[PDB]
Nucleic acid binder design. Structure first.
Lengths: 75, 76
DNA sequence: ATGTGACTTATAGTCCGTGTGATTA
DNA sequence: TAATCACACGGACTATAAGTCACAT
């Protein structure tokens, strides 16, 4: 159980949904399997930084904004 | 290899030194091996979020702090 | 559109070391 | 004498992430 990891996964889901995207959409765009993405959102996967960097590209977001957004999800 | 990995491994090493801690010290406070902290600093090495989370605790800074500094060091 | 258990390969991360170039004596 | 210190790097592990799937929702 990690505080940071479940914030990171909540932030990912949020953005994806804000932007009206599906997992299949985020998957194609980060070049990750869409069942991998589902595992990440359900907080059952401790992704690495390389993986996280592809997700960000996949959300069509900068690293700076994603982290800003993450510090905003941390409250 | 990865952009974000070099920045993350840079900021870790910076803060570490700004608190005059050793790699041995950081390893001990983070519950990682000293040889792994060496690798993270030298070769960037693909940490997980959990292990980043532990290195933030061992550095003794808030998650917010770390990320604010991470942002800055990407902005050239 | 998405959750999940199962699986194999790849690599994250551990634990024993040695060597070099600085100290402090 | 040394004698620690701080780090790079090794070799050989072990633990877990990566990456994928059929079948269900």
């Amino acid at each position: 159980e990690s505080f940071l990891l479940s914030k990171v996964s909540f932030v990912i889901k949020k953005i994806r949904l804000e932007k009206g995207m599906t997992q299949e959409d985020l998957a194609y765009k980060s070049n990750l399997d869409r069942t991998y993405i589902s595992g990440i959102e359900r907080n059952s996967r401790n992704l690495t930084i390389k993986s996280l960097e592809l997700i960000m590209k996949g959300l069509e977001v900068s690293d700076v904004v994603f982290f800003e957004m993450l510090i905003k999800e941390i409250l």
